[PDB]
Write an enzyme that holds these catalytic residues in place. Structure first.
Site, PDB file in Angstrom:
ATOM      1  N   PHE A   1      16.081 -57.962  -8.811  1.00 58.31           N
ATOM      2  CA  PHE A   1      16.854 -58.228 -10.029  1.00 58.31           C
ATOM      3  C   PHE A   1      18.290 -58.698  -9.807  1.00 58.31           C
ATOM      4  O   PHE A   1      18.939 -59.122 -10.747  1.00 58.31           O
ATOM      5  CB  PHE A   1      16.803 -57.052 -11.006  1.00 58.31           C
ATOM      6  CG  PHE A   1      15.601 -57.079 -11.902  1.00 58.31           C
ATOM      7  CD1 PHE A   1      15.594 -57.873 -13.044  1.00 58.31           C
ATOM      8  CD2 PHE A   1      14.471 -56.327 -11.594  1.00 58.31           C
ATOM      9  CE1 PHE A   1      14.474 -57.914 -13.878  1.00 58.31           C
ATOM     10  CE2 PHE A   1      13.342 -56.360 -12.419  1.00 58.31           C
ATOM     11  CZ  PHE A   1      13.347 -57.158 -13.564  1.00 58.31           C
TER      12      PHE A   1
ATOM     13  N   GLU B   1      28.188 -54.579 -22.162  1.00 57.38           N
ATOM     14  CA  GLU B   1      27.196 -53.509 -22.189  1.00 57.38           C
ATOM     15  C   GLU B   1      27.820 -52.118 -22.102  1.00 57.38           C
ATOM     16  O   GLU B   1      27.600 -51.377 -21.142  1.00 57.38           O
ATOM     17  CB  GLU B   1      26.148 -53.740 -21.087  1.00 57.38           C
ATOM     18  CG  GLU B   1      25.342 -55.025 -21.324  1.00 57.38           C
ATOM     19  CD  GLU B   1      24.298 -55.320 -20.259  1.00 57.38           C
ATOM     20  OE1 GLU B   1      24.605 -55.247 -19.047  1.00 57.38           O
ATOM     21  OE2 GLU B   1      23.161 -55.658 -20.648  1.00 57.38           O
TER      22      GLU B   1
ATOM     23  N   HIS C   1      27.070 -49.339 -18.794  1.00 53.22           N
ATOM     24  CA  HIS C   1      25.677 -49.577 -19.180  1.00 53.22           C
ATOM     25  C   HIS C   1      24.811 -48.331 -19.027  1.00 53.22           C
ATOM     26  O   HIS C   1      23.940 -48.065 -19.859  1.00 53.22           O
ATOM     27  CB  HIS C   1      25.068 -50.727 -18.366  1.00 53.22           C
ATOM     28  CG  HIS C   1      23.846 -51.333 -18.991  1.00 53.22           C
ATOM     29  ND1 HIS C   1      23.410 -52.602 -18.683  1.00 53.22           N
ATOM     30  CD2 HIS C   1      22.986 -50.858 -19.927  1.00 53.22           C
ATOM     31  CE1 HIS C   1      22.324 -52.876 -19.384  1.00 53.22           C
ATOM     32  NE2 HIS C   1      22.045 -51.833 -20.146  1.00 53.22           N
TER      33      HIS C   1
ATOM     34  N   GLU D   1      32.325 -51.865 -18.060  1.00 49.53           N
ATOM     35  CA  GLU D   1      30.890 -51.776 -18.329  1.00 49.53           C
ATOM     36  C   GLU D   1      30.379 -50.366 -18.063  1.00 49.53           C
ATOM     37  O   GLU D   1      30.512 -49.836 -16.944  1.00 49.53           O
ATOM     38  CB  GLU D   1      30.066 -52.808 -17.534  1.00 49.53           C
ATOM     39  CG  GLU D   1      28.549 -52.540 -17.676  1.00 49.53           C
ATOM     40  CD  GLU D   1      27.632 -53.730 -17.416  1.00 49.53           C
ATOM     41  OE1 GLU D   1      28.097 -54.834 -17.061  1.00 49.53           O
ATOM     42  OE2 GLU D   1      26.407 -53.541 -17.571  1.00 49.53           O
TER      43      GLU D   1
ATOM     44  N   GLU E   1      24.789 -64.394 -22.997  1.00 50.29           N
ATOM     45  CA  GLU E   1      23.758 -64.507 -21.947  1.00 50.29           C
ATOM     46  C   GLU E   1      22.446 -65.007 -22.555  1.00 50.29           C
ATOM     47  O   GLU E   1      22.047 -64.551 -23.631  1.00 50.29           O
ATOM     48  CB  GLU E   1      23.505 -63.156 -21.247  1.00 50.29           C
ATOM     49  CG  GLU E   1      24.732 -62.555 -20.577  1.00 50.29           C
ATOM     50  CD  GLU E   1      24.535 -61.156 -20.002  1.00 50.29           C
ATOM     51  OE1 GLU E   1      23.398 -60.777 -19.628  1.00 50.29           O
ATOM     52  OE2 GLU E   1      25.554 -60.432 -19.903  1.00 50.29           O
ATOM     53  N   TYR E   2      21.783 -65.938 -21.866  1.00 47.05           N
ATOM     54  CA  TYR E   2      20.456 -66.435 -22.278  1.00 47.05           C
ATOM     55  C   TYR E   2      19.800 -67.183 -21.117  1.00 47.05           C
ATOM     56  O   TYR E   2      20.465 -67.506 -20.131  1.00 47.05           O
ATOM     57  CB  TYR E   2      20.557 -67.333 -23.529  1.00 47.05           C
ATOM     58  CG  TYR E   2      20.968 -68.769 -23.254  1.00 47.05           C
ATOM     59  CD1 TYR E   2      22.242 -69.077 -22.766  1.00 47.05           C
ATOM     60  CD2 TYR E   2      20.083 -69.823 -23.490  1.00 47.05           C
ATOM     61  CE1 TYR E   2      22.613 -70.389 -22.508  1.00 47.05           C
ATOM     62  CE2 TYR E   2      20.447 -71.136 -23.242  1.00 47.05           C
ATOM     63  CZ  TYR E   2      21.711 -71.414 -22.752  1.00 47.05           C
ATOM     64  OH  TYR E   2      22.066 -72.718 -22.503  1.00 47.05           O
ATOM     65  N   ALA E   3      18.502 -67.452 -21.232  1.00 42.44           N
ATOM     66  CA  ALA E   3      17.754 -68.149 -20.177  1.00 42.44           C
ATOM     67  C   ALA E   3      17.961 -67.495 -18.813  1.00 42.44           C
ATOM     68  O   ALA E   3      18.543 -68.088 -17.899  1.00 42.44           O
ATOM     69  CB  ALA E   3      18.125 -69.613 -20.138  1.00 42.44           C
ATOM     70  N   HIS E   4      17.487 -66.258 -18.700  1.00 44.40           N
ATOM     71  CA  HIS E   4      17.578 -65.459 -17.475  1.00 44.40           C
ATOM     72  C   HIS E   4      16.834 -66.179 -16.335  1.00 44.40           C
ATOM     73  O   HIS E   4      15.602 -66.236 -16.322  1.00 44.40           O
ATOM     74  CB  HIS E   4      16.996 -64.067 -17.764  1.00 44.40           C
ATOM     75  CG  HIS E   4      17.311 -63.030 -16.732  1.00 44.40           C
ATOM     76  ND1 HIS E   4      16.390 -62.618 -15.791  1.00 44.40           N
ATOM     77  CD2 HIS E   4      18.419 -62.278 -16.527  1.00 44.40           C
ATOM     78  CE1 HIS E   4      16.925 -61.673 -15.036  1.00 44.40           C
ATOM     79  NE2 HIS E   4      18.158 -61.451 -15.458  1.00 44.40           N
TER      80      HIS E   4
HETATM   81  C1  IPT Z   1      16.574 -54.994 -17.556  1.00 43.59           C
HETATM   82  C2  IPT Z   1      17.255 -54.869 -18.927  1.00 43.59           C
HETATM   83  C3  IPT Z   1      16.818 -53.590 -19.638  1.00 43.59           C
HETATM   84  S1  IPT Z   1      19.030 -54.927 -18.802  1.00 43.59           S
HETATM   85  C4  IPT Z   1      19.459 -56.582 -18.360  1.00 43.59           C
HETATM   86  O1  IPT Z   1      19.345 -56.688 -16.937  1.00 43.59           O
HETATM   87  C5  IPT Z   1      19.533 -58.029 -16.484  1.00 43.59           C
HETATM   88  C6  IPT Z   1      19.012 -58.081 -15.051  1.00 43.59           C
HETATM   89  O2  IPT Z   1      19.404 -59.272 -14.366  1.00 43.59           O
HETATM   90  C7  IPT Z   1      20.998 -58.440 -16.720  1.00 43.59           C
HETATM   91  O3  IPT Z   1      21.902 -57.643 -15.940  1.00 43.59           O
HETATM   92  C8  IPT Z   1      21.350 -58.280 -18.206  1.00 43.59           C
HETATM   93  O4  IPT Z   1      22.765 -58.432 -18.428  1.00 43.59           O
HETATM   94  C9  IPT Z   1      20.884 -56.941 -18.790  1.00 43.59           C
HETATM   95  O5  IPT Z   1      20.940 -57.038 -20.216  1.00 43.59           O
HETATM   96 NA    NA Z   2      20.624 -59.110 -12.410  1.00 43.98          NA
END
Ligand code: IPT
Ligand code: NA
Ligand code: IPT
Ligand code: NA
Ligand code: NA
Ligand code: NA
Lengths: 211, 211
Positions: free
Chosen positions: A209, A69, A26, A24, A145-148
């Protein structure tokens, strides 16, 4: 790739696994800066190839993933083909670079909504229902990934499931995610409390987060 | 096929035309009883071939249609191929037998709803959004008939147009229909009034369904 016992337990208890390379990048600008660079192909190749060599005998592993990512670079296309050549028994997926690149057997977006388009330049997140029928598109769609589920969340979860059940090629997804990444700290009396980003003097940080 | 001047006016004013053979066997049981019978192939063939021979030079004609509500029979397949052979310049469509048969270049359902599936045995009317992405399906979808404008009607019209604009392969449709088929009658005082089915002593009849 997980602790080796994880796959043994998934084999025996019965869970489908997506095994994912430790790649990754990112934080790069743009996200594919390293993954499009042939000088990083050796390092990336070993994170993919050594995963396959370790885990290819586990029945629970049904899908290989090139990582997460890291945009989409020529290195991804090379490693995609390497897996397809070495292990035809498992589809390969990868989300970077717009979730439907040439390095993925499965349309695998993250946080694509059910009905609402998010038409970002270069890497749009189409409504999943719309994504399936884009001109020329034929692949299955499974959200990586979905439904954060951050705090008081999962609003609209039923909307995904109604769609998954109605559309044959919408074959589900992976909720983000299982378990809060909070850590134990102790007050002056030794009582434990749950800590998140920044609570260890770590800075810069991304606060809650991690949960 | 219409009065020959119609096509001249569509050429000059600018309207896209679907030119449709004079073949409808709606009342048969099942609907394809005649259209799957090779005995009726000659009669059918002339209704298709003589239409194409007459109208093939009109620019306004952009799509050929094999008729209407006659189920799906082998005669449709033969005549579909005849048109493709004689005139490669225009797609051929036909709705009979479930709107996505081997006799149509365009998924052309009648009264398929935007979001709601109607899963009739043998001839389902899928949600138009869902229909596009059925496993293996790649054709454009244009409703041959939708939004039945009978009396106080066209509720939910906006829902169609929202879907048409969002989905590339949803390329619109043809409203049913343009003009009430009411007929003028006169009362005892010689005053005109609008009449529908049954108002001429005709029976059986389908009353106001002509409007
Ligand atoms: C905040 C976004 C621009 S990135 C976003 O952050 C999330 C935070 O839990 C996850 O890590 C996701 O995988 C990521 O796409
Ligand atoms: Na996170
Ligand atoms: C009433 C349905 C069983 S058939 C239905 O009837 C309509 C009446 O205006 C139109 O003729 C449509 O073309 C037809 O599908
Ligand atoms: Na599904
Ligand atoms: Na469209
Ligand atoms: Na009618």
């Amino acid at each position: 790739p997980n602790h080796p016992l994880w796959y043994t337990l998934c084999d025996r208890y019965g869970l489908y696994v997506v095994d994912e390379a430790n790649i990754e990048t990112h934080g790069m600008v743009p996200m594919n800066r390293l993954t499009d660079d042939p000088r990083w192909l050796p390092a990336m190749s070993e994170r993919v190839t050594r995963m396959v060599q370790r885990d290819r005998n586990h029945p629970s592993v049904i899908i290989w993933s090139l990582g997460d990512e890291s945009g989409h670079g020529a290195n991804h296309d090379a490693l995609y083909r390497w897996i397809k050549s070495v292990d035809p028994s498992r589809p390969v997926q990868y989300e970077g670079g717009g979730a439907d690149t040439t390095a993925t057997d499965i349309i695998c977006p993250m946080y694509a909504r059910v009905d609402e388009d998010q038409p970002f330049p270069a890497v749009p997140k189409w409504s999943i229902k719309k994504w399936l029928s884009l001109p020329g598109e034929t692949r299955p769609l499974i959200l990586c990934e979905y439904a954060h589920a951050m705090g008081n969340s999962l609003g609209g979860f039923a909307k995904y499931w109604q769609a998954f059940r109605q559309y044959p090629r919408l074959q589900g997804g992976f909720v983000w995610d299982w378990v809060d990444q909070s850590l134990i700290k102790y007050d002056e009396n030794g009582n434990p409390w749950s800590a998140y980003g920044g609570d260890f003097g770590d800075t810069p940080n991304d606060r809650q987060f991690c949960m």
